[PDB]
């Protein structure tokens, strides 16, 4: 089922149901900063249990509204706290009580400290 | 049912609440959306799935405010007919069988789901 989703969205990328209304960019620091702070104030990620599908609904909402390619929202590997690889995005996945139940949590410090970078230089 | 519990939880109000106010699906709304999707969209020819229908349902729910409880079809086997009158897409088999979204403008004037299955009304 995991692989079946990738092939579906890449077919869907031209186009489904409508191609996005705005010019189609890649995710920036400031965009990711504004969208996070937006989603806290108005809208509701805070607390929700993470899933492959929910992330996709969130990725597609940003893609259709703002035009940012859904290529961006990636976190560090487990176990434990799951840090965003795209700097600017102020959400991380915390466990709640080796795969485990995660939760989107806002953290304004993520704006100033690229914690994924500091813990895993591997990726850069 | 693993999806429905997640979907219900989400309904207040992930990822944002839809911007235009909520209202139930109508004949004309369904008609207009269908004819929009054929001209300026890409629902045509695409293989159906549970997730693809949900992406479509949520795009409508967010864009236009229609609660996603309207785009259901008749049971199989064979040509799968829309229960909501106005919606001009049906799911045709390609040859549990592989279905494809197909625009049919005659669905606007004949409630084929009604004529074949009066049990649902
Ligand atoms: C799976 C999620 C599908 C995408 C849902 C969000 C798409 C909404 O899209 C936006 O809707 C606004 C009104 O709400 C309009 O003003 C914008 O022009 C439009 O881009």
Residue numbers in the entry:
A (entry chain A): 53 to 149, 177 to 203
B (entry chain B): 55 to 149, 178 to 203
Question: Mind quoting what the paper says about this structure?
Answer:
The nef genes of human and simian immunodeficiency viruses (HIV-1, HIV-2, and SIV) encode accessory proteins of 27–35 kDa critical for viral pathogenesis. At the molecular level, Nef enhances viral infectivity and replication by stimulating multiple host cell signal transduction pathways. Nef also hijacks endocytic trafficking pathways to induce downregulation of viral receptors, including CD4 and chemokine receptors, and prevent cell-surface display of MHC-I in complex with HIV-1 antigens. The folded core domain exhibits the highest degree of sequence and structural conservation among Nef proteins.
Helix α0 packs against helix αB and is connected to helix αA by a long loop containing the PXXP motif, so as to form an α0-αB-αA helix array. The total buried surface area between the two Nef monomers is about 2000 Å2, with helices α0, αA and αB from each Nef monomer involved in dimerization. Nef (51–205) helix B residues I109, L112, W113, H116, and the methyl group of T117 from both Nef monomers interact to create a hydrophobic pocket.
